[PDB]
Amino acid sequence: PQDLSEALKEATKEVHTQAENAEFMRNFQKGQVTRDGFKLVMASLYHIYVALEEEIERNKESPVFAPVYFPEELHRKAALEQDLAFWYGPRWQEVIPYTPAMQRYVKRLHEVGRTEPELLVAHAYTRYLGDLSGGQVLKKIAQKALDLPSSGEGLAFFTFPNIASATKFKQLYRSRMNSLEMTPAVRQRVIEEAKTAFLLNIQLFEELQELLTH
Template sequence: MLDRVEQIDMAGRSTRPASLLEAMRERTKVLHVTAERTGIVAELLRGRGTRAAYAVLLRNLLPVYEAMEAELLRHAASPVTGLIVRPELHRSAAIAADLAQLDARDLPLLPEAITYVSAIREAGSGSGHPLLAHAYTRYLGDLSGGQIIKKILARSLSLPHEALSFYEFPEIADIPSFKNEYREALEQAGGAMTEHDSVVEEAATAFQLNITLSQALQAAVGLDG
């Protein structure tokens, strides 16, 4: 793993972690717990969701992934952001397929999803380096907690395999190994850029956007408590 040079204060103490991944993980640790324990995500993890609620979640995540994937591809030639552009992770087509399987129509697009999309487009402006934070938040989540959600949804909602494409990665043969490779790519990207602190803060923003959307979706589908 590529080491980063730590910043040192006047007393010779380190002022930030040596790796981008470590810094993002530390900055979002509390937010990560909050994301799992609140909103529609928490309801799904507890097996208290409905097909309608899941469809509304997908409807609101679709433009988020479309924006993120479009911005990542736009920066595919970047020596920094390009390191984490992996089309096998792209989820927008899978989400659209799941919505078709669920025969989901005329579902609401919440303002919180629109805000999330705007934040991703802003992250993609300029160097595009803040996109590292959004890829870290969404894709590693899909490869980790998303696999747990898939099993719960299949059981609690009796969803067929064809309606769970969002959590399927047919082009990735070994998910644990791929996650390690992707973390390494994030580290290499972190070592090749200078906006370390702003990207770490963008990771916190990404988690907060997810939490806010999840809470809004919980209220919209009537799963409060």
């Protein structure tokens, strides 16, 4: 559809279904996640968000990203550092895994941010709006399954404290995505990058599932 927000949703409809069907996702939705499995995901998300939010800061002024620049409402790096310190302890940054599928995702993020900053919106869309939509649902599953201590730590990633209403912000973010000035050629590449982003997520959760058994 003419609006980029609708165009991205239509284009990634099929790959989103693939993600829903993914083995780890099937297991998680039924509360079959272990602490090691959950730690593995938190570690992955950290690496992904470090790369993404590094590239966002590099391209925050540029007309190709500036309209969708919402650091205070969306940034997840700081929250993930807080959570990993709980999950992996004081030595978290030394001991956290960095696997091929994490590397490939991080690699693509840096490639986009450095050489194709016009497509960064596709990765920011895929990460932020996805994580915002499922944040509280995924948290509630994690709370039930993982049986945490009363330490008040470990799940900061799943709350966006500067977004009171997810629907309110998502409507604003979509409008800002639609406000982006781009040529027909760039627009098509943005669409393709969104599918690539979804596929990098699918490839990641497939790898994580493979690593968990055993």
